[PDB]
Design a protein around this ligand. Sequence first.
Ligand SMILES: CC(C)[C@H]1C(=O)N[C@@H](CCCNC(=N)N)C(=O)NCC(=O)N[C@H](CC(=O)O)C(=O)N[C@H](Cc2ccccc2)C(=O)N1C
Lengths: 924, 481
Amino acid sequence: LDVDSPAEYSGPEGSYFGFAVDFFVPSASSRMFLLVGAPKANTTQPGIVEGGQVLKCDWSSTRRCQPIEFDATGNRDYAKDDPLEFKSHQWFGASVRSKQDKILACAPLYHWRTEMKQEREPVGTCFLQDGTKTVEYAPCRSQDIDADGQGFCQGGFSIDFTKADRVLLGGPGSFYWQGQLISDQVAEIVSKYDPNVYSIKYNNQLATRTAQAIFDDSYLGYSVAVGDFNGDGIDDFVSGVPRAARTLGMVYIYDGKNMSSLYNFTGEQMAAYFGFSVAATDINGDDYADVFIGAPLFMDRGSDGKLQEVGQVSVSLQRASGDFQTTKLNGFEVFARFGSAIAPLGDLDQDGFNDIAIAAPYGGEDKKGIVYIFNGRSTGLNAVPSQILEGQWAARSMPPSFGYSMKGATDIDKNGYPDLIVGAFGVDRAILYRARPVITVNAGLEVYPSILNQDNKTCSLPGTALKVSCFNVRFCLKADGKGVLPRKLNFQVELLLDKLKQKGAIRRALFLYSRSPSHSKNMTISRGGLMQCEELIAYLRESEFRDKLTPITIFMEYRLDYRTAADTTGLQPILNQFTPANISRQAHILLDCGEDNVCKPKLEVSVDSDQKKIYIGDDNPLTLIVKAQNQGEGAYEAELIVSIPLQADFIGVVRNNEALARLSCAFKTENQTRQVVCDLGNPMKAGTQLLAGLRFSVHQQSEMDTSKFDLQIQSSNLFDKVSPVVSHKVDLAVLAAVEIRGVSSPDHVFLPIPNWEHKENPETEEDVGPVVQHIYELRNNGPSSFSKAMLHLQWPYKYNNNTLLYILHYDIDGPMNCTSDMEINPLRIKIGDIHTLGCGVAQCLKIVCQVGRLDRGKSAILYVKSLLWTETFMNKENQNHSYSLKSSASFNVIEFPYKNLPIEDITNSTLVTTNVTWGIQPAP
Amino acid sequence: GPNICTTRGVSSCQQCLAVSPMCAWCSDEALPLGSPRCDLKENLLKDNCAPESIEFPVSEARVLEDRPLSDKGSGDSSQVTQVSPQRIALRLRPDDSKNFSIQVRQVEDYPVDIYYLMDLSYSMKDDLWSIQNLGTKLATQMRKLTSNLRIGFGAFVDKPVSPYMYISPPEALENPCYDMKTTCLPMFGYKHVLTLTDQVTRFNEEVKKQSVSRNRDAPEGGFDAIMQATVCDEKIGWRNDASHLLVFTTDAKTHIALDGRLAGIVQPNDGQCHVGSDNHYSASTTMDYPSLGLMTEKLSQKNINLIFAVTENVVNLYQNYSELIPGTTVGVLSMDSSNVLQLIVDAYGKIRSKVELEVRDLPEELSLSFNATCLNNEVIPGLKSCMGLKIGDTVSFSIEAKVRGCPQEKEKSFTIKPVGFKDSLIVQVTFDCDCACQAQAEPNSHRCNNGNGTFECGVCRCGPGWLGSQCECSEEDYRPS
Ligand SMILES: CC(C)[C@H]1C(=O)N[C@@H](CCCNC(=N)N)C(=O)NCC(=O)N[C@H](CC(=O)O)C(=O)N[C@H](Cc2ccccc2)C(=O)N1C
């Protein structure tokens, strides 16, 4: 249904123009018109105000609307100054029905001066216009006066034309508003007309009769329709009775030959107004009329369980046995009054099944009205609406009521598809929607080599001698369509060589010529069986991509060139609703495991480090010597991922030994981790094992860390792509190589010293003798550090009751604290063969030193300064004797910063010697 | 060794008392040297400070006045008391507070509004007496169940248009009973007669001063009247707190939405107040009847309870209608009205209250924490509400006060008021942050070290170069002795 440029008509403001609409298709002439009711338009009839009008509108010929000269007579006089009828404010045009040349309009609110007594009574009336003759028709203007008879019949409230030129008319007010149906032959209506007679009687009239008082205020005749429900070939009458059965509502079907009741439908909810609008039409192509009944005010359980007013439509399919099959449709909004108007459309799309429009005139945004189109299918109506038309005029002083009246099933433009007319009497408008031709397009795409091989590199790449693999893609388009359509349609086709690959990551296929993953072409097609086809040759990139498992998807989409496919009036065609706008198909590529296209891996990992012990310091980079293997059908895009400790940092693969693979690798910190990612073949050859030679910095910068790497091998395989987790744990060794050494200066001395004299109470350095200085060094020449250690140093003090080396002082480098067990500088002195002398035979002095932190390779020193006691050697006990004084130093470590790690008690010692000789020996 | 009374470098009574309630200053000069004058309260009383040399101020709340919460509904000396206590005093130590309880008990009778809708169709001529008797007895009954009853009424016949109206004879417009040669009032759509008022006698007289009219079709336009009585607030006089009842009387079927198309009325009911200054439904002839959905929606929107008071022969019909309008009851209208009065008695029995506290005159310097002990002794900290209260039901709220430091004003007040209830609890608030000892201040006079300071609480606030316990020492002077 065209919805962008429909035909809009307007009547005089406040005229209700559009209350009732219909088509006019004269048999004599060829042009078609629209008939629209204006039940409040102001007419030129003498003395009549708001008499109502029926307007004929020209459609394409400038869309002019002009009134029909139905009646130019004001009130008639039953006597001088005694009016007979009250045409003013009659709702003439409240119901318009046209069949060939017969136009029938009705005024339900026409009161006439009862012939027996001066009195108003709305008997209603109608006008029937043939080619040129025009007559007035009013069954209820009879001698059955008053409400108890046909006084308030209000005939013409609803009307319809029977297939065999019988007019059916519904008076909802007859017999105390019980209602009534009157069916009369048009020929008898025109033949019996007599202007001087007001109660004309027709011989072949079919009418219902008065019933008991229990049926009062039932409103039979509120709406009418025609359809055959007993198979006699003569259309039967269907009427809605919205107030029957304690207000439940009902629908009566009366035989169209003797007016005998056939079927009764009953509602289920009070006051739902089940029967406001009825429609008979076959909705499943079974040739049996089906009944649609509207209940605009039906209330149903809401989301919260509370009743909400949405309306309802009951669809009763007829069956041969006489039963009925009833389903129901519910409205999609609250207070929208869905089901107010039901309009058969005929085959709106030529799908073979009749389609129906249902109006919710107070739905949509701003309550501007809405209309839903339901397409008929075999076995019932498609409960899901296919199209939704929305009102476009805002309320001036009254709801627009768009969709309050509808009429379809007439091809006004002669394009082979029926059109629709909708009334917006709230804004006094009428809108014609033209149905568009429905083109059904069958598109067939096929890739002959569904599975493609790189090895089939038999195709010459244009522009270069290089070779590629060429595969075929075929695409065919056939566009069928009923009705007036252009003989030729310019379709546009677009093909994508690789769907998915989101964000344009990579596309592995390109057309042989003008390499590009997309290609579009305009191909003409003529409506017919010629399945016009075209082919393209596309080639894949050897190692330009890293994903050879996910299938390559070919995608095709076609767009009809609507612009040039329209008619001369500018009505563009449409494509079928259910046909998919795109067709996609799957290609494939395989490596190894040919028979098992679904290729299954079986991965396995192992790890065993060579130097599984570390010294907690500067050492060779740690290498795991990882083993990776597979025994499955393969391993695609295999990669080894190793998570390393924070103390380990990635190092390049080992090139010293060629047995290890020449594997490129990289590092990342995804998700706050420490990952080393290397490749293991894409794919692994029969799962053949590989040997890793990667290294790591294993930089241990936290003494509290205890002793581990984890690792895995994964692949791009679609299943079983994760290998078992394999972890290794190296150990930490405390290689704190502590060494103690020393030196003495001078290394030798000659006695007696030059310019020296014996002194009994020396007070300065010169008085005692030469200065002897000893340096001791403790160095932790190892990768492992210690936090606290114990240091010792023993010194020779006195030999033969005589001092050997008179200590002057001891100096601390700073990394240790020292304490002397014996008095230092007791007297407070101002600062042949050689025999060994030391603490073994001589009174000895020792100084105990506690050493603090000593890092990797760090060292500390201790200094001792002493004076050589010359008088000791000048004594008789040592005269002409040469000696070698000895001292020893020792260390012992006690506390390491690696508190968690094991601590080993390591100790050692060394010696420092000085030489003294008698320079002035006796003459030989 | 107090956590904050000495660690904060406390040296003044004012700040010693202002830092926290746990901190107090020992003032007497007789205190021997030792722990500071602001030791922990638990041990400061024994840490060389005599009992009379220290004060331990503590926040407290005093219930000066209280009253039993009017257990029974009889008259009181002045009026019933709904909330207790009546007034309390609260001396709050800086940054100190505690708990106090307030209990509420509904004793006042509920406010009720009744609107009576009378069908004045000709079919009711035999039922007019029953309508009048029911209208009188509604008040006579409810007045004995409550005291805030307001009553009113209106009437309806049908839309004044063809085919419903009697328009045919020129002189029948003023007497639709022209055919029977009797007189009946001209027919009308809907007219609001008497607003909701407490004058029961006026309502009785007006109801008994009514007469019937006549239209054509048996169904009536009562739904228009219901909708207008619902959506019109000022005209009807609905109260925002009273329980609203809308009694509706009829004896025949009812017109429903889309029945007006027969009369040329196709505009859907607007659902707006359309009663003009003449107390007539001015949109009767141009707007259709209202659908049941709209009626239910508007009844719910304004908390109006709808009761059908219908005759026997239609009761079932309207009974079924009640199923489509949840929250509505139906009763037989007859000479014996007890059956339909039981509906109103039950409806009144169904009334329930709400309790919500208020905070009116509090400043930003004070706050409360609420803990509600609602019905069934269910305790729930963190709210100020309670539902499902009958007459005589009781709830309580334990409230913990809180004050920031020492507010800038010594005296204040705040009133706690239950929602709707006129009664309230008034709380007077005072603060005693100032040091009582500081009343003996002596700036630069005798004591201290020849002046040069201000003796306040055993310590002299000495000037520059005079810092010390009694200004005997300077800021940067040390005694080698
Ligand atoms: C007969 C009498 C006992 C009774 C009655 O039955 N009225 C019906 C019967 C019509 C059915 N006839 C058919 N051939 N199908 C009727 O006409 N109803 C429509 C109406 O006119 N109702 C009005 C109320 C109104 O104005 O709102 C009103 O006049 N009802 C009268 C009231 C009455 C009762 C008893 C004596 C006199 C009048 C009514 O109930 N009937 C006429």
